[PDB]
Amino acid sequence: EKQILCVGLVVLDVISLVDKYPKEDSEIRCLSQRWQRGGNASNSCTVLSLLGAPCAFMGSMAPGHVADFVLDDLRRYSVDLRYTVFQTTGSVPIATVIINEASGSRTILYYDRSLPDVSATDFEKVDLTQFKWIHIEGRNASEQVKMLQRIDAHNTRQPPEQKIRVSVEVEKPREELFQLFGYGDVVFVSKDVAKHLGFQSAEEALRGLYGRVRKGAVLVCAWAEEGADALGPDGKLLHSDAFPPPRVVDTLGAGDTFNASVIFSLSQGRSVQEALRFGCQVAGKKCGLQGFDGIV
Amino acid sequence: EKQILCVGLVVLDVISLVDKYPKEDSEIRCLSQRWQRGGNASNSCTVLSLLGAPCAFMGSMAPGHVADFVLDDLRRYSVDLRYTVFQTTGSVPIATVIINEASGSRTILYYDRSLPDVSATDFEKVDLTQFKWIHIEGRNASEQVKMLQRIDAHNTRQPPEQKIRVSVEVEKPREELFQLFGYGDVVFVSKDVAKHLGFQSAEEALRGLYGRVRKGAVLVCAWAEEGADALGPDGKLLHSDAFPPPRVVDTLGAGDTFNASVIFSLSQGRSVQEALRFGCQVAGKKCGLQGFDGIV
C-alpha cells in the first residue's frame, strides 16, 4: 500500500486550558497546560494514521528537545519521517494555544517563522513512486509550485492507474498562496481566505473561485457550523451539514481532521459527497474529544 | 547599609506581544515573544535594586535551565540570593503573559503551584540582624504568620532604632491571606481584594479595613488610574493621583513597581504622602517603558 505524503510544518502547541476566555488585563489560573504536536499537515498525518492510512510527513526540523518531543510523537503514529529536512539554523515553531473549557474554542498566538522552509530542491529528492497521494500545506508558494510541477511532470509519464493524486490547502489569506489554486486534484480553501476575498458563504466562494482551479479539480470549502461544500467539474454544488458532538470540548485541529478525512475517503474511492459527509462527521467527533486519538 | 529582604516567589514570565487583544477563536501572529523574570516580590527586588537599595530575595527554586535564567537575572541586579530555598521537587512557575502593544495591558495566564513554598522553618535560618526592612508577598499565610511572629519577637529585643520595619502584600482575594492584615508596619492591599470584599474605592477599602491592621500600621491601596491612597494611625486619608506616561506600552509589574517605590521612599525616611506620590510616579514611568530598567 503506497503512502500518503503530507508536506507541511510541524509546530509545538503549548496549550493552556482555561475555564473561561480571559478578559483583557485580568489574571486567570489555568486548569492545565500541555504540549501537543500541531501544524496543519502534521495534524492531518495524525488523523490519516488513526484512520488507517500509511503516511509520511515532510517538514523542516531543528534538532533539540522540542524536535525529540514532536518526532517521537510522529513515530508513535508510525508516520514515515524519511524526508524530514534537518536545518542547522532556526527552531521548531511554537504556538501558544488558549482553549476555553466552557466552549472548546481555540485561540492561537503564533510567531514569525523560526526555521527554513522545505525547498523545491529538497522535494526533488523525494521518491515519487512511493506515494499515491501528496498533500501540500500552502506556505512558501513559489517553491511549492515547483514541487507541484515536479509531480505533474511525473504523472505525465504515468498511466492514469499510476497517477499520484494531489491536494493543496490554502488556509492563510496571503496573496502568494492563491497561485496554488491552479494545482491539485483537490483544493481546500479556508473560510478565512474566502471571507478575505469577499465571499459570505461556502457556496459563494466555490462559484467565485472554481474558475481558478485546474481542469478536473474538486474545490472544497468548510464553513464551520455551516458544514462543508465542494464543487467539481460537473458544476454541481455538494454540501454536508456539520455533525456537532453533544458537547464541544476541543476544536484545535478540527479543520485538519476534516482535511485528512476528506483525503482519506477520496483516496479510498468514495464520492465527493460521501467524503464531505465523512469529513464533517470525523471533525465533529474530534471536537467532542481532547486531541485526536478517540476519533477511532 | 543593611539590606531590604523580600520573601516571595520568582516566576518565569513568557511574554507574547500582540498588536491587539486576541479575539476568542482567532489566530494571531505575535509581534514578539520574550522571557522576563517576574513574581511580585521578585519584581519588587528589581525595582529596589534599580532605585539603589541593596536587597535580598528569598524564594524557592528548582534547579534547571529556567532557574539559571532567573537567577542570572537576579545576579545582574546584585540581589543577594543567600537564602534561596532549593527544592528537590517541582519546577519554577510559568506565567503566560499577553501584552497588547496598542494599550500596554497585560493579561496573565498562570498555573497551579509548581514547587514547594518557603516555610517557617526555612525562614528560621535567616540572620535577621542583616536587614532593616523585610517584605513578604502573601502566599502561604499560616507559615508566613510564623515568620512574622519571629520578626516581631526579634524586634521586642531591639531598640526602636534597631527595629526591622515590615511590609506585607495581600494581593489575591483568598481568605487565608486576610490574617496577614494584622502583621506589618505597612500593609499593601490590592484593588482586587478590596473589590472582592465589597469596597468600591480605595478610600472605602482603607476605612473598611484599617481596624484589622496592627497598632501603628499604614494601610496602602493603589487603585490603578485613580492613583493610590494610604491611611495611618492618625486617621487622615492620604492620596496621590496617578502619573500616567504619555504612552502606556507595558504595565506588567507596575503594581510591583509601586510597592517597591513606596517601600524605598519610606525606608529612606520620607512621609507616607511623599511615598505614595513617589510610588505613583515611578509606577507611571514604568508603564511607559518595556520592563523596568528605564525607571532610572
Author numbering:
A (entry chain A), B (entry chain A): 3 to 298
Publication text:
Ketohexokinase (fructokinase; KHK) is the initiating enzyme of fructose catabolism, converting fructose to fructose 1-phosphate. Ketohexokinase is a member of the ribokinase family of sugar kinases. The KHK-A subunit has two distinct domains: a central α/β-fold and a four-stranded β-sheet. Gel filtration and nondenaturing polyacrylamide gel electrophoresis have demonstrated that KHK is a dimer in solution.
Residual weak electron density in the nucleotide site suggested partial occupancy of nucleotide carried over in protein purification and one of the bound sulfate ions lies in the middle of the active site. A sulfate ion binds at the expected site of the γ-phosphate of AMP-PNP, probably impeding the binding of cofactor and substrate. In the high-salt KHK-A in the absence of substrate, the side chain of Tyr112 is fully orientated out into the solvent. In the crystal structure KHK-A is an elongated dimer with appropriate dimensions of 44 × 101 × 47 Å. The dimer interface is formed by the extended four-stranded β-sheets (β2, β3b, β6 and β7), which pack approximately orthogonally to form a distorted barrel. The overall structures of KHK-A and of its binary and ternary complexes are very similar, with no significant differences in main-chain conformation, except for a small region between residues 113 and 116 (Tyr113, Asp114, Arg115 and Ser116). The electron density around residues 115 and 116 is weaker, suggesting some flexibility, and alternative main-chain conformations may exist. In contrast, the structures of apo KHK-A and the KHK-A ternary complex did not exhibit a similar closing down over the active-site cleft of the β-sheet clasp region upon substrate binding and the KHK-A and KHK-A ternary-complex structures are very similar without any hinge motion as defined by DynDom. This suggests that the structure of apo KHK-A is either in the closed form as a result of crystal packing or that KHK-A does not undergo a conformational change upon substrate binding.
